[PDB]
């Protein structure tokens, strides 16, 4: 694995580390994505991303193929996928996304996430921009720069986490502990977004985010979420919104889809469904894996 064997094609994105390039292996023909690091030493994000991806070999997790070094550059060589889910939803603006594909993608995301969690990895940045799709119908978790290896039981970890629209209420309310449930919350938001093609909770601040969630699911009390009124960032002045008809949250969903979404968006992280358990939900009784309905 060396840089002389790769021919750069085009820019395909931007991240930390910086720009991401599509490239071609001149000898095998393999198309790859190249993530470049300029060399405080090696960035902690890169250390975590590489170490964790090397453990996480699964069909629904982006594959790290190689790490190419130099004194002054570090290249991460990944399998190439044609599009992210955000770009796919934008491409589906007037068609919508076929239900069999929404179901397939959610099932695959749950598989990838269950694998992460069973290997003590929290992703902590699940959003459509970080989910990559290929021409054969696969969807894969990507961008593990914000991930971390967790302990059993968890201790307090970074409080920054998850991009705001996809951030779980336990993070927003400042709980000392969060765990795997934070990723399930994000996937629930993503499930809703696949169906409506708009973000479920598009807040601009932490408090706006919380209030958007409360207006959709009701303001939680001690019955629905024991301990909530004692959480660090809970305020007794919070408006107490009624929980609306859950069928109105994502109107196209039918009984099984609603059931699954409601379990992913449970306030109490203890009660919120695990990725492993969600795989067996009746929503997936007829799941298949078709190719995308659009050219990528």
């Amino acid at each position: 694995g060396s840089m002389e064997n790769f021919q750069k094609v085009e820019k395909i994105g931007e991240g930390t580390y910086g720009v991401v390039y599509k490239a071609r292996n001149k000898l095998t023909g393999e198309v790859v994505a190249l993530k470049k690091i300029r060399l405080e030493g090696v960035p902690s994000t890169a250390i975590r991303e590489i170490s964790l991806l090397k453990e996480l070999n699964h069909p629904n997790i982006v594959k790290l193929l190689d790490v190419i070094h130099t004194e002054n550059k570090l290249y991460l060589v990944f399998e190439f996928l044609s599009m992210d889910l955000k770009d796919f939803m934008d491409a589906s603006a007037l068609t919508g996304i076929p239900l069999p594909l929404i179901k397939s993608y959610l099932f695959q995301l749950l598989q990838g996430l269950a694998f992460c969690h069973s290997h003590r990895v929290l992703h902590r940045d699940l959003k459509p921009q970080n989910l990559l799709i290929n021409t054969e119908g696969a969807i894969k978790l990507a961008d593990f720069g914000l991930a971390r290896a967790f302990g059993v039981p968890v201790r307090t970890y970074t409080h920054e986490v998850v991009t705001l629209w996809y951030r779980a209420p336990e993070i927003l309310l400042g709980c000392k502990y969060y765990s795997t449930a934070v990723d399930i919350w994000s996937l629930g938001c993503i499930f809703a977004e696949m169906v409506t093609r708009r973000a479920l909770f598009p807040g601009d601040s932490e408090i706006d985010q919380l209030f958007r969630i409360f207006r959709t699911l009701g303001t939680p009390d001690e019955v629905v979420w024991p301990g909530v009124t004692s959480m660090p960032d809970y305020k007794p002045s919070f408006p107490k919104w009624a929980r609306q008809d859950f069928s109105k949250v994502v109107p196209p969903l039918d009984e099984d889809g609603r059931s699954l979404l409601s379990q992913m968006l449970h306030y109490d992280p203890n009660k919120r469904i695990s990725a492993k358990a969600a795989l067996a939900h009746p929503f997936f009784q007829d799941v298949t894996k078709p190719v995308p309905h659009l050219r990528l």
């Binding site: 975590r48 090397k54 070094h69 290896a149």
Partner: protein, 257 residues
């Protein structure tokens, strides 16, 4: 909850894959177990100075032992390996790792920032970026969930004993982290409450007192001899109220095993 069993199983797989070479010190021409003990004791002090997690210390030691399993190192460079290992462990594990400048400072200007950063790169290359290693600490926190009921002195004492094991390559390099954790948990439980390795942990781990006996016999001796050990930073650390002053507790004279 849903993942406790899966994670334990995975960590049991990975501790075998992440284990350093048991006989490596015999292959090191210039360094000894004593020099290693000095280094690890210093890392404990660094962890104290910068209020680092215990997990960070345990990771750094794993990195050092794996590094020394394939790389010959002169005694004058041993601290540079340790410094880079601690920097890497901090970047991996800590919310707020100390800045590189801070690691340079605690070497007492023995090394330059460039040396530390070049060593960081070398350690990553030698370890092939495989930093998510299971530690004694990771097994201990799982075992603690089996207390009936939870006891802070037991937890801190188990952590103390697990940490003492980091200092002495002979004999502890021969035991897996899950086994050292088992011995430490039993010894702590027995010292504080008079209880023994619980049956629920036999079901979880497959270990019995019989299987833990060789490690437990070693750990008991280390515990009995701890006040006389050349290295004392761990004993000093565990006097703190943060760890419930557990290094002040008297070790049991016998175990009945």
């Amino acid at each position: 909850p849903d993942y406790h069993e899966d994670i334990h199983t995975y960590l049991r797989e990975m501790e075998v894959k992440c284990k350093p070479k048991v006989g490596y010190m015999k292959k090191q021409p210039d360094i000894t177990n004593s020099m290693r003990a000095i280094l690890v004791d210093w890392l404990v002090e660094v962890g104290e100075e910068y209020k680092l997690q215990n997990e960070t210390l345990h990771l750094a030691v794993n990195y050092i032992d794996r590094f020394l399993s394939s790389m010959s190192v002169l005694r004058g460079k041993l601290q540079l390996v340790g410094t880079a290992a601690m920097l890497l462990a901090s970047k991996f594990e800590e919310i707020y790792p100390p800045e590189v400048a801070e690691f340079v400072y605690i070497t007492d200007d023995t090394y330059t920032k460039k040396q530390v950063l070049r060593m960081e790169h070398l350690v990553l290359k030698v370890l092939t970026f495989d930093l998510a290693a299971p530690t004694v600490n990771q097994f201990l926190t799982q075992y603690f969930l089996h207390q009936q009921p939870a006891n802070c002195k037991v937890e801190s004492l188990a952590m103390f004993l697990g940490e003492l094991s980091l200092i002495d390559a002979d004999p502890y390099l021969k035991y897996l982290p899950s086994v050292i954790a088992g011995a430490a948990f039993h010894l702590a439980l027995y010292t504080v409450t008079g209880q023994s390795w619980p049956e629920s942990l036999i079901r979880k781990t497959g270990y019995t007192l019989e299987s833990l006996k060789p490690c437990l016999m070693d750990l008991h001796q280390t515990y009995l001899k701890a006040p006389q050990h050349a290295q004392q930073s761990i004993r000093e650390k565990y006097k703190n109220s943060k760890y419930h002053g557990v290094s002040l507790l008297n070790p049991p004279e016998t175990l009945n095993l």
